């Protein structure tokens, strides 16, 4: 509350560390469905079904322009990529498996880096 604060966690490396995690995600061999925005002209259904499209390049641009207030908002956009993938793709599909793999990958790096 007012004038009563928990001890001050150091957040000054968070930007760099989130950038590193993103680089590791960008360069994974299963990243290919998530590197660029889905082409909303050429993919039927996507515009209507996926209310909040997200992809790594868009995450990269937001990161680099100071559009993430904190590391929790960054984790939400990353997760949103995989939740979107689950919504639109069958589990038994190259793209569906890519999403489950990439989620696992991210979640481990995140815990190892911050928890």
Swiss-Prot record:
Q: Could you say which tissues express the protein in this record? A: Expressed at varying levels in several tissues, whereas a smaller transcript was expressed specifically in testis.
Give the subcellular location.
Nucleus
Q: What domain of life does the native source organism fall in?
A: Eukaryota
The Bromo domain covers 9-113
Family, according to the entry, reads as follows: Belongs to the WAL family.
Subunit comment: Component of the BRF-1 ISWI chromatin remodeling complex, at least composed of SMARCA1 and BAZ2B, which regulates the spacing of histone octamers on the DNA template to facilitate access to DNA. Within the BRF-1 ISWI chromatin remodeling complex interacts with SMARCA1; the interaction is direct. Component of the BRF-5 ISWI chromatin remodeling complex, at least composed of SMARCA5/SNF2H and BAZ2B, which regulates the spacing of histone octamers on the DNA template to facilitate access to DNA.
Q: What does this protein do?
A: Regulatory subunit of the ATP-dependent BRF-1 and BRF-5 ISWI chromatin remodeling complexes, which form ordered nucleosome arrays on chromatin and facilitate access to DNA during DNA-templated processes such as DNA replication, transcription, and repair. Both complexes regulate the spacing of nucleosomes along the chromatin and have the ability to slide mononucleosomes to the center of a DNA template. The BRF-1 ISWI chromatin remodeling complex has a lower ATP hydrolysis rate than the BRF-5 ISWI chromatin remodeling complex.
Q: What is this protein called?
A: Bromodomain adjacent to zinc finger domain protein 2B
Give the source species.
Homo sapiens (Human)
Gene field: BAZ2B
Span of the entire protein shown here: 2054 to 2166 of 2168
């Amino acid at each position: 509350s007012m004038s009563v604060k928990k001890p001050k966690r150091d957040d000054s490396k968070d930007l760099a560390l989130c950038s590193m995690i993103l680089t590791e995600m960008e360069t994974h061999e299963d990243a290919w469905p998530f590197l660029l925005p889905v082409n909303l002209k050429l993919v039927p259904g996507y515009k209507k079904v996926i209310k909040k499209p997200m992809d790594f390049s868009t995450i990269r641009e937001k990161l680099s322009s100071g559009q993430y207030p904190n590391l929790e908002t960054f984790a939400l956009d990353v997760r949103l990529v995989f939740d979107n993938c689950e919504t639109f793709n069958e589990d038994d599909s190259d793209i569906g498996r890519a999403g489950h793999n990439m989620r696992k990958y991210f979640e481990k790096k995140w815990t190892d880096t911050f928890k």
